Design a protein around this ligand. Structure first.
Ligand SMILES: Nc1nc2c(ncn2[C@@H]2O[C@H](COP(=O)(O)OP(=O)(O)OP(O)(O)=S)[C@@H](O)[C@H]2O)c(=O)[nH]1
Ligand SMILES: Nc1nc2c(ncn2[C@@H]2O[C@H](COP(=O)(O)OP(=O)(O)OP(O)(O)=S)[C@@H](O)[C@H]2O)c(=O)[nH]1
Lengths: 243, 243
């Protein structure tokens, strides 16, 4: 029962949120941890599955591989244990209320390599949580970018993907609210995309402007591993997705 | 004049295509090369700009950084030379008919870090070419994924982005044509997205089904650095974009 997958650019906090959301859930639930990151040093949780026991980036780099070569090469090698890791995960799923899956440092390793894609395809209705550093959020279209990236992850992995900001504890309340408006109120971002004479911006207005198509929900989550902000919302979204 | 930016997942062939398309253009043009990849070993072209002269991944890794940490950290450090590298590029642009920009091994380093984003934002109408390994191409929605990823890069960088497959020389003519149908004929992919009862697939049908919205063009390029397939089409698209 319940498999939640944390997905995000390096630095966004996937690992931190896996550990901390896990501890949060370990008050009322059976929780298992799955590390799919080959090039990670230390984990704040204790994994039932650690792909580092099979291969690691740096170890492959001692063969003359560049960093971006040893990463890619590490996931080529993991395919040797594709079926083994899949069945292990399916087994954890029967033994726990939550399996939390921590992904490769770079999300493109997950999204573009066969390992992650095929793992996700053969898993029972996993929930993806796609987390962003609010720091990426400058111009109006950034907001549109976030929501479309989630849709794309959703397309690519064939799993419901929840868009989330992490580290919201670092935000001033000004910034806090400034993001909510754009993310909450739709007609608001849309307005700010209107007064954009430039090439891109109109391109984004005409995009997100579908509102009907897109899909009513996909309210954005505000999480923080530090204050545990948002965890109850996530917990809620996950049982709701399981329903 | 003409700045073309190669963007793609690690392994897709950005560097190879930069060198080879450069040589192709160096029969009729003045061409400059720009390496923005900090963690790259050897280049098949001679760069006017090499960000490795300032920082490199592996060098930062000898400070205790994990691979995905030293990558990210390398682009934090490049911001110290943001304005310097920008003006250098703007100068190459006045001295050449083509500036070819080779990007970070991982495209998320480019798409999510301030360096790449702000560089692209302050450049004159650059053309992005987004290249994919045909190997990613299995199910119908993969095809929709490619075209939407380009749109997103386009959104995120504020530059026209041309979707391309690279290494098409590796394809059998069966596969060759199989991809063209899906990519060429729209109503064709759309048909194959129809007979999809599953959650994702309908989600993708209802997506790409806009056809009116999206935007008529964005015909996909078939490139190969080995046979120089597609180069004349690229060359053509680039002067056409410059128009
Ligand atoms: N203030 C604040 N910092 C956070 C939060 N979550 C993570 N961080 C910090 O961000 C940095 C990156 O966290 P991390 O969990 O490693 O990201 P990741 O790269 O996506 O995950 P991984 O590749 O290690 S598995 C760490 O220093 C971490 O402590 C948060 O909610 N609030
Ligand atoms: N058959 C074939 N192989 C190619 C082609 N282009 C690149 N390759 C091969 O693919 C591998 C990856 O190429 P590369 O140019 O390094 O990709 P990249 O990672 O995106 O670029 P970079 O990070 O080095 S800057 C190399 O072995 C290269 O020779 C092609 O058009 N056809």
């Amino acid at each position: 029962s319940m498999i939640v997958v944390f997905v995000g650019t390096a630095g966004s906090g996937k690992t931190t949120l896996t550990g901390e959301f896990g501890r949060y859930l370990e008050d009322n639930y059976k929780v298992a941890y799955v590390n799919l990151d080959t090039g990670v040093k230390e984990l704040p949780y204790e994994p039932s599955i650690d792909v580092r026991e099979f291969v690691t980036v740096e170890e492959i780099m001692r063969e003359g591989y560049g960093p971006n070569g040893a990463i890619v090469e590490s996931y080529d090698r993991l395919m040797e244990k594709f079926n083994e890791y899949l069945n292990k995960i399916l087994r954890l799923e029967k033994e726990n209320d939550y399996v939390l899956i921590d992904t490769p440092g770079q999300m493109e390793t997950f999204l573009f390599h066969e390992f992650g894609v095929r793992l996700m395809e053969n898993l029972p209705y996993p929930l993806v949580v796609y987390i962003s550093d609010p720091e990426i959020l400058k111009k109006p279209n950034d907001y549109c970018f976030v929501r479309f990236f989630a849709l794309l992850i959703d397309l690519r992995l064939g799993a419901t993907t929840i868009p989330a900001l992490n580290k919201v504890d670092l935000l001033s309340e000004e910034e806090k609210e400034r993001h909510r408006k754009y993310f909450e109120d739709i007609d608001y971002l849309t307005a700010r995309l209107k007064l954009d004479p430039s090439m891109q911006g109109l391109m984004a207005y005409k995009m997100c402007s579908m509102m009907t198509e897109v899909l009513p929900p996909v309210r954005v989550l505000y999480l923080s591993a530090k204050t545990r902000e948002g965890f109850e919302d996530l917990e809620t979204l996950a049982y709701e997705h399981y329903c």
